[PDB]
Amino acid sequence: MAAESVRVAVRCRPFNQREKDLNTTLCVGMTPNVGQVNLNAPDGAAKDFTFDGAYFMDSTGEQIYNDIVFPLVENVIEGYNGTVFAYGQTGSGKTFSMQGIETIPAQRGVIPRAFDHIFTATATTENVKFLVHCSYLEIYNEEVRDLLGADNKQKLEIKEVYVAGLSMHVCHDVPACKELMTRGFNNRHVGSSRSHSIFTVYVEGMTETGSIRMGKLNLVDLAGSERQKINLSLSALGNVISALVDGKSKHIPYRDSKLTRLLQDSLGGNTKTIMIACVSPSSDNYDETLSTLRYANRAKNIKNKPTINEDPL
């Protein structure tokens, strides 16, 4: 019912083989106890930032999920809208935090964890019956496409907010969700750096009193945040966040891109939103990391108004 700011967590990825070979300097510092993130310049001069979560090179998707995503997914199951999106330059770790890996068990991402969590929590609740639906879309060069639809290479129209004609796939267990994510990656545009993608899980709960709640979860993997209408949605996103927090902007320019129009309810609206800002640890990425930290620091101040979406008969 009440005003709720956007939760922001920073996740610094570990060095990569090449950063180790080059003998790259660790310019990023963290003190997770108070969500502190520092960025050291080549001379030593540090820049300090405070976030709701700081995850250093040794962090797992298992610990980020438990701390930040798990209470949001419980909120979704109660009839709330929830949005989790990854922000950061190409290479920073956005996809590793969203999808993750299944050969290091603690490094499974927030997406397959939300599937296991939703299906386990809905199976334990005997006082509410549940219908799970799943959609998956991609926005490349302002062209919205349905990664699950019958014609995966067709542009879609938006009406008000919804993507008019997007397929909503019913899921009866976790493997049904995993089949859509697998088939959705094969429908990505080739003719994954400059495109964005939204995977939504809708949780409809019918209670014994009779009322029905409808909460949805948006799992957003954004395009690379690196400097340079291919970048229209990314520039509009920053402009939207800027308008939302600058205090002078009475009119938020959501209609300036396909991504901002869709995620409009997740930025200032009836949604509990979480941003996962992914950063690289190496000094060769100083400018992009500084850009991402400043951008995520501004996102902290977006004021949403999430309420329970539960209509009684």
Author numbering: 0 to 159, 165 to 195, 203 to 239, 254 to 338
The authors write:
OSM‐3 belongs to the homodimeric kinesin‐2 subfamily and is the Caenorhabditis elegans homologue of human KIF17. Similar to KIF17, OSM‐3 is involved in intraflagellar transport in the distal part of the cilium, and both proteins are autoinhibited at the resting state. The OSM‐3 motor domain shows the typical kinesin fold, with a central eight‐stranded β‐sheet surrounded by 3 α‐helices on either side. We have determined the structure of the motor domain of OSM‐3 either bound to ADP or to AMPPNP, or devoid of a nucleotide.
We reasoned that, by adding apyrase just before setting up crystallization trials, nucleotide‐free OSM‐3 might be incorporated and stabilized in a crystal before denaturing. Indeed, OSM‐3 crystals diffracting X‐rays up to a resolution of 2.3 Å were obtained in these conditions. The structure was solved by molecular replacement taking that of ADP‐OSM‐3 as a search model and there are two virtually identical kinesin molecules per asymmetric unit (rmsd 0.44 Å; 308 Cα atoms aligned). The electron density maps indicated that the nucleotide‐binding site was indeed devoid of a nucleotide. Instead, an electron density was located close to the missing ADP β phosphate, as observed in other structures of nucleotide‐free kinesins. In the case of OSM‐3, this density is well accounted for by a sulfate ion that likely comes from the crystallization solution. The structure of nucleotide‐free OSM‐3 is however very similar to that of the ADP form, with an rmsd ranging from 0.49 (chain B) to 0.55 Å (chain A; 304 Cαs aligned in both cases). In particular, the L9 and L11 loops, belonging to the Switch 1 and Switch 2 regions, respectively, are disordered and the neck linker is docked onto the motor domain core. Relatedly, the structure of nucleotide‐free OSM‐3 is closer to that of ADP‐kinesin‐1 with a docked neck linker than to tubulin‐bound nucleotide‐free kinesin‐1. Finally, we note that the overall temperature factor of OSM‐3 was unexpectedly high (about 87 Å2) for a 2.3 Å resolution structure, likely reflecting further the instability of this kinesin in the absence of a nucleotide.
